[PDB]
Symmetry: none
Subunit: 109 residues, 4 copies
């Protein structure tokens, strides 16, 4: 239903959003524990998720404006433009959108 592919280099979210979009995809956004795990397995290191507080300050939503219905915050998170990264243990950290991380793109038919 969803194809996940990781980038080779680390980059800020703006470059990441543009990368996934180029091939009609989006920055990976897990809707449940299974997808979270799926993305965690393809990413070789900490990677960006398609969740930010860009539209509404300090309120996390997906790239379509919906508040996320699934989260998996690391202990102490989200700790406050805010972005989200998926750690190697699968938990989430709140980080600056300007910092660079691997990118996992999500694709569907």
């Amino acid at each position: 239903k969803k194809y996940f592919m990781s980038s080779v280099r680390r980059m800020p979210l703006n470059r990441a959003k543009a990368l996934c979009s180029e091939l009609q995809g989006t920055v990976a956004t897990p809707r449940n524990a299974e997808e979270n795990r799926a993305i965690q397995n393809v990413a070789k290191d900490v990677a960006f998720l398609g969740i930010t507080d860009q539209r509404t300050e300090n309120v996390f939503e997906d790239l379509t404006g919906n508040r996320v219905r699934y989260t998996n915050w690391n202990e102490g998170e989200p700790n406050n433009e805010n972005c989200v990264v998926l750690l190697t243990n699968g938990k989430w950290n709140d980080v600056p959108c300007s910092d660079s991380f691997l990118v996992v793109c999500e694709f569907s038919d």
Copy 2:
């Protein structure tokens, strides 16, 4: 191997960079079946990865290949294994 086409047109350089950044390469037809599958994904003229990018050419809607400059812009179809 699955194929995905870009939303916009671009020169082969940017195209090779795009597919490789996501760990694939510009679609390279190995047989009539793949050439056909690649055209099916590209819904208009698109670059091919042609030696292939790892040891220019565009695929037309009729499935035939034309030799065009590596500097002009067309759609890109990336292939992933």
Copy 3:
């Protein structure tokens, strides 16, 4: 992704509102498997979330559809901008008036 069918037949406008009220949308098949899944859930002719209202058949998200399964002779235009799509019991698609009434299959996801 899961699908649920309505009990009543209704026009596209009502269909859309119905599905969205429970955080879903009108079922929109992205491949043959999904088309089959929707086919199984609706045991009768039902609306799909595809129309030409914004033009060109697009999903209720403004994107042109990348999957279709037109019945022989379809799509037969009913009138620019008022074209909708229904899935027949055999799984093929017909182009019909958005104002006509059909069952509705809503799609939901996590």
Copy 4:
């Protein structure tokens, strides 16, 4: 049984129609586990399928059967000269009675 919530608030009458349209019914918790599950789908205050229209302070599900399991906030309701009373699930998981005419989120339950 699986649950789904609405995006907007509405009176009980409209909620009943909404859930039935998709072959379900307004969610009715039959035990604490379901109650917790419905509250989890329903982040905010939501209607349950229980009212005392017939006899004041006696709550029945939408089929006319008096409910067994209850999780009243501050004990059983004890209204007087009241309109039809409905039940909403609060953020604390307890139940509170409110006029069926007021508007709250809806949680539908399905058995598909």
